[PDB]
Amino acid sequence: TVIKNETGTISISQLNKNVWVHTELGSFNGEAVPSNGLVLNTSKGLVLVDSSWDDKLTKELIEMVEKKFQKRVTDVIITHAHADRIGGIKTLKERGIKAHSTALTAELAKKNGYEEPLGDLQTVTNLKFGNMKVETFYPGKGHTEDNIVVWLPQYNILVGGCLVKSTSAKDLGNVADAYVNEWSTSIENVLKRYRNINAVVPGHGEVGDKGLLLHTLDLLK
Numbered sequence: 695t696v697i698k699n700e701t702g703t704i705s706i707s708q709l710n711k712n713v714w715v716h717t718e719l720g721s722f723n724g725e726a727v728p729s730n731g732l733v734l735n736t737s738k739g740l741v742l743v744d745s746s747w748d749d750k751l752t753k754e755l756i757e758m759v760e761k762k763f764q765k766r767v768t769d770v771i772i773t774h775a776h777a778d779r780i781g782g783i784k785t786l787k788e789r790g791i792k793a794h795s796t797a798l799t800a801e802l803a804k805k806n807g808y809e810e811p812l813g814d815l816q817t818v819t820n821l822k823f824g825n826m827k828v829e830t831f832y833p834g835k836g837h838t839e840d841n842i843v844v845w846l847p848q849y850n851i852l853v854g855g856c857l858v859k860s861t862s863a864k865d866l867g868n869v870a871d872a873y874v875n876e877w878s879t880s881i882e883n884v885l886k887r888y889r890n891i892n893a894v895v896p897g898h899g900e901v902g903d904k905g906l907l908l909h910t911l912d913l914l915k
């Protein structure tokens with residue numbers, strides 16, 4: 695099941711009964727650039743993994759999911775301090791939506807002029823929202839110094855975020871903020887921690903499996 699807004703700039707795609715991928719198009723130099731996160735439909739509200747490029751898109755994403763699922767967005771996990779992830783932080787804060795992050799992500803957000811998420815996540819943090827279990831894991835530096843992954847142990851779904859490249863990505867993209875001698879080790883740390891993975895959601899591009907991790911390793915050669 696895929697559901698879209700009018701222009702198609704926001705889309706939600708169902709992985710299972712309570713887990714959807716959200717995808718938004720940002721516009722840069724005339725080019726549409728998609729970005730993915732997660733929508734978790736829990737008994738106590740909606741939880742997102744990541745916001746979107748800006749506040750306009752974040753507001754519309756929130757409004758779409760609250761209407762559809764008939765409950766409020768209560769929490770967002772921000773997986774690094776780039777605009778695709780954190781661009782909607784003003785909206786989250788003013789609506790009273792909790793914005794979780796590592797301390798480092800919050801430190802980088804502040805340095806770069808964004809409002810700050812909570813800085814509450816550790817190297818491993820286990821959260822529960824209603825019956826939905828969520829683990830966050832900092833595997834080390836890669837796409838950025840601060841990138842984290844999110845694991846849903848009830849589904850063995852990994853949100854790789856922008857640490858993990860989709861099959862369609864043929865290069866590493868912008869590496870200004872990346873750690874290209876460490877990114878492989880960080881990917882290996884993910885593979886070590888999660889030895890049995892169903893889906894892997896990359897930050898940009900199509901959902902895949904463990905193969906996306908191996909693809910990212912190959913791109914780093």
Ligand SMILES: C[C@H](CS)C(=O)N1CCC[C@H]1C(=O)O
Pocket residue numbers: 727776777778856866867868897898
């Ligand atoms: C703006 C995002 C932040 S993760 C980005 O760097 N992307 C998005 C797609 C690839 C890569 C790039 O521009 O090189």
Ligand SMILES: [Zn+2]
Pocket residue numbers: 774776837838856
């Ligand atoms: Zn990024």
Ligand SMILES: [Zn+2]
Pocket residue numbers: 729776778779856897898
């Ligand atoms: Zn990204």
